[PDB]
Design a binder for this molecule. Structure first.
Ligand SMILES: *C/C=C1/C(=C/C2=NC(=C\c3[nH]c(/C=C4\NC(=O)C(C=C)=C4C)c(C)c3CCC(=O)O)/C(CCC(=O)O)=C2C)NC(=O)[C@H]1C
Ligand SMILES: *C/C=C1/C(=C/C2=NC(=C\c3[nH]c(/C=C4\NC(=O)C(C=C)=C4C)c(C)c3CCC(=O)O)/C(CCC(=O)O)=C2C)NC(=O)[C@H]1C
Ligand SMILES: *C/C=C1/C(=C/C2=NC(=C\c3[nH]c(/C=C4\NC(=O)C(C=C)=C4C)c(C)c3CCC(=O)O)/C(CCC(=O)O)=C2C)NC(=O)[C@H]1C
Ligand SMILES: *C/C=C1/C(=C/C2=NC(=C\c3[nH]c(/C=C4\NC(=O)C(C=C)=C4C)c(C)c3CCC(=O)O)/C(CCC(=O)O)=C2C)NC(=O)[C@H]1C
Lengths: 278, 277, 278, 277
């Protein structure tokens, strides 16, 4: 292994991916306590200025409009002057975290089972390459199926993720079905303040959609020429069983409809993997 | 996974330990969706009856009294006709989960972990306290021991090697304190067996009363262990080790000394990291 | 104040507590220059006889055995015919001071932080009462937390040590983390000779474990019915910040393991008090 | 404490005054653990290089020559190629600390303190000498003054009241003599910034070269003070007062007259106590 990074607190890196914006706030006043340093391009004020403020005079008016279904359902589509956005709400460290990400406009045998899953996910995402790993007893990911376009750069990248995926990464994969790295060549954006005063550490990004990625893994994607990477967790009876990894040589937006279909497919596959016995 | 029992979804077992009571509810009406089957002795109605009801007409009034700091602080002590209780609130699967547990009434590196072992044994009063440090294969190595004179579980410095599954280590990372009040007690099922909105049992990752894997409960019984109380040692937010306390019978620890136990794990986490930078 | 005693040279009283024995010696011959008047019960010769002698024919053979780790580490446990003892070595006035004290046998918010410290120390010592003082800008100790057994003689002794703890006492508390008065009803033992010839004054007992206590404070403990008193200095960034005072109505040996855990706790607390800013 | 600067750990500032050099080492190998950053001009190697080395191959040979009386007497004069030096040895934090400072070459109660003031001004040659007596609130009261004709720091009988912090008075109690050679000079940092074995800087309570609190150094500069030389007046081992000498520029005092200064403080301590018993 590489113990120097297999103890990496990947939930505490204090950064997001640059295509979105993250805000966090506590209390009934809804006072901003965390804000990504890139937030001015979307919110019209400098981040150090927005700290301390209630969200009512911080969020764009289009978001505050949909605030009720946003709390109810945890997500809502909104149309900002900057374009279409997805808003996503979850709870963490006692803070309510708000993530804004660009969206399209809305105006007017077991190997055989996993092979069809591979082909199905590649059809839904359009990504060049899709790989399905199954974890063995040593938690090595075994390449079990591949779907790919004809004539490929990333050849047969059938190498196992061996003494590989650290426990903290597998724990996040268990708690989140979908993980998107929009562009491995893009730069992470730091969260402000660097440590949350109430916590003595950075905000926990375990369930954050925009969570920046361990540099060691981002470098592994870049060496492969991978731009976008989109991953689906395969659970069996609530336990991590495998991983579907989609790699595309450049950014390629997937869109919410086909992302949601991807997650439903992981739920359908979990049923099929468990019910095969009982 | 890591064998016949290391694939166990220990967060989804659907039970609590029998010394406490758990309720869960969604929505602004606060409609009961989850209830432990033992709840009648504390709430005065059958659980199958309390399902569907708002909490305002479900919880005892002493609890609803302190409901503001209970939501505010996440915990509050209350005095019920049955005696003193701790109420504990967290969110899970979109439900807000309330746990009621009885309480008393209210009117070098090896050397550092050696003192930690002696400090925890004095705070808990438990017969034996062990400090494990996890190596690179996530095997726990016994690094310090504090224990009373003349022991039944004498010198247990046998390592937990191909042992503590990832799901257990993940919960040790997310919760600083874990208490098994009595390994001879029986788990109490949560009702309904699967949450209708979820298709599975309520996720008990952050539950104080979460029941115990039958295989580990059986291993505790074989040792003559009654109570088991664990403190997670984190370094820079990553699981580093475990302080495991074993007692031959039940022994209440009490909130003051639990809270002192948790502060010590925070103090120790500073010392393990700041030792470098 | 009481200026008649707030200039008391409490480091120069020339006495020890009666439960231990103190020896001091200079030079490469290691010639006894200071000896407590109670030393015969442990060493088998009269103190005036042991003066001038090298330690090789003065110390018990069990102590001279462990002399190497005693110098190396500053402390060592030894088993004498009289029972188990702790030996403690430090330097003072150019003399090397040796203190022997009985030991058990070894054969086969900020207020919330200080409240847990109070409860933790009471658990480690077993003393009836534990009080935590924090010093304000006038160096008054403010009672900030209390841990105590149910149903108490020393009620709520929440009175501040006000125009109180003299500067010389606070200086010794800064230089020593742990201070034990084994029994406030016991009698101090004089050091011989009454003044050290080389110095023109008594041996400086600033860092002595057995140092006898100012009579005015010993009388204050007795009036409270206090037998044992065990104190821990709280430092922040090397400066005296507060004091944890343990009082027990009778003698109660604490034992080295739990004393050492007590001192580590004061070091851990000092980190938490300083790092809270930087 | 006693304000924004009266909590200052003046024994832990991690610097020395730039006119001298400090080394510290532990163990029987005499391994360098502390070294002032200015040490190369005197020892001929970079400080970061000398760390880890035994002193026998670190100190100049003239110093190791006199090493027996240096350990014996605690001080010895040596003649280096750079000129005459004083070597000074004491123990602190388990380290033995060696300080090198340049030296010249060697081939009623008010009335008593008035003569003491005139005696110290003649011994030091400094422009102004003040005698403070501490009252019961540990405020220093000006009790006698000796000074040259026509003064810049004319008649400074303003009291140091809510002033001299406890940490400064504790060091005045433990050291009879304190010299600030030049308040316009710059402190030299000790390397490494914290002692690895200690988690903090070396304790400089008994160091001759110990640097000065920035706030007090700035107050000296505002007065046009270059050199400052202090004598502690003890009565029965307790701090009683201070003789403070101020000079508008650096002025070496020389060991003979420093030693005479210290003997006078001992003679005065006899007279202040024996006046009763
Ligand atoms: C230092 C820790 C390591 C590590 C971290 C890591 N891997 C993740 C997902 C993942 N990694 C791989 C394969 C590799 N990643 C590497 O860095 C290397 C070698 C240098 C390899 C061979 C795979 C196949 C996967 C599954 C996802 C995929 O694209 O296939 C993650 C989580 C990333 C995230 O989404 O946040 C982390 C943190 N991987 C290691 O091998 C070691 C070096
Ligand atoms: C089937 C899975 C296994 C398993 C589950 C498990 N262990 C936990 C804590 C823990 N276990 C041990 C040691 C053992 N437990 C066993 O069942 C056996 C062998 C039969 C051994 C040797 C230790 C030392 C620890 C640390 C805690 C302690 O008391 O010392 C837990 C979490 C329990 C909880 O709090 O919920 C689980 C789920 N342990 C395994 O070894 C395999 C069998
Ligand atoms: C004449 C000097 C005084 C003095 C000396 C003193 N106090 C010490 C510790 C300590 N004292 C108190 C409280 C009191 N001590 C008293 O004598 C009186 C009044 C008569 C009071 C109110 C406290 C709270 C503490 C902290 C320790 C504790 O048990 O709480 C010491 C050092 C003793 C030692 O360990 O050597 C000295 C020398 N205290 C004064 O108030 C004045 C009278
Ligand atoms: C922030 C802490 C303070 C402080 C520290 C201090 N004083 C020392 C000796 C000393 N100071 C004074 C008078 C002053 N020093 C000041 O900074 C100020 C105001 C800005 C005043 C009025 C005197 C008279 C003395 C006695 C020595 C002398 O030269 O007269 C020392 C020790 C210096 C040393 O040798 O290391 C310290 C650390 N003094 C304070 O008044 C407050 C501000």
């Amino acid at each position: 292994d590489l113990s120097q990074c297999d103890r990496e607190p990947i939930h505490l890196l204090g950064g997001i991916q640059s295509h979105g914006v993250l805000l966090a706030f506590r209390g009934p006043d809804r006072l901003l306590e965390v804000v990504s340093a890139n937030a001015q391009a979307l919110l019209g004020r400098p981040p150090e200025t927005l700290l301390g403020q209630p969200v009512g005079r911080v969020l764009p008016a289009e978001v505050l409009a949909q605030w009720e279904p946003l709390v109810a359902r945890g997500s809502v589509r909104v149309v900002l002057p900057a374009g279409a956005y997805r808003a996503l709400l979850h709870e963490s460290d006692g803070l309510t975290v708000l993530e804004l990400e660009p969206a399209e406009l809305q105006p007017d045998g077991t190997q055989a089972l996993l092979q069809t899953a591979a082909d199905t996910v590649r059809a839904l995402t359009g990504f060049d390459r899709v790989m399905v790993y199954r974890f063995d007893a040593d938690w090595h990911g075994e390449v079990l199926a591949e779907s790919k376009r004809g004539g490929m750069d990333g050849f047969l990248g059938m190498h196992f993720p061996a003494t590989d995926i650290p426990v903290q990464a597998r724990a996040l994969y268990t708690r989140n079905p979908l993980r998107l790295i929009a562009d491995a060549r893009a730069r992470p954006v730091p969260l402000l303040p660097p440590v949350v005063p109430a916590l003595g550490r950075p905000l926990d990004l375990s369930n954050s959609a925009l969570r920046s990625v361990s540099p060691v893994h981002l470098e592994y994607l870049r060496n492969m020429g991978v731009g976008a990477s989109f991953s689906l967790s395969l659970l069996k009876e609530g336990v991590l069983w495998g991983l579907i990894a989609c790699h595309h040589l450049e950014p390629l937006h997937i869109s919410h409809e086909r992302r949601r279909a991807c997650e439903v497919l992981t739920q359908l596959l979990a049923l099929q993997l468990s019910a095969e016995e009982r």
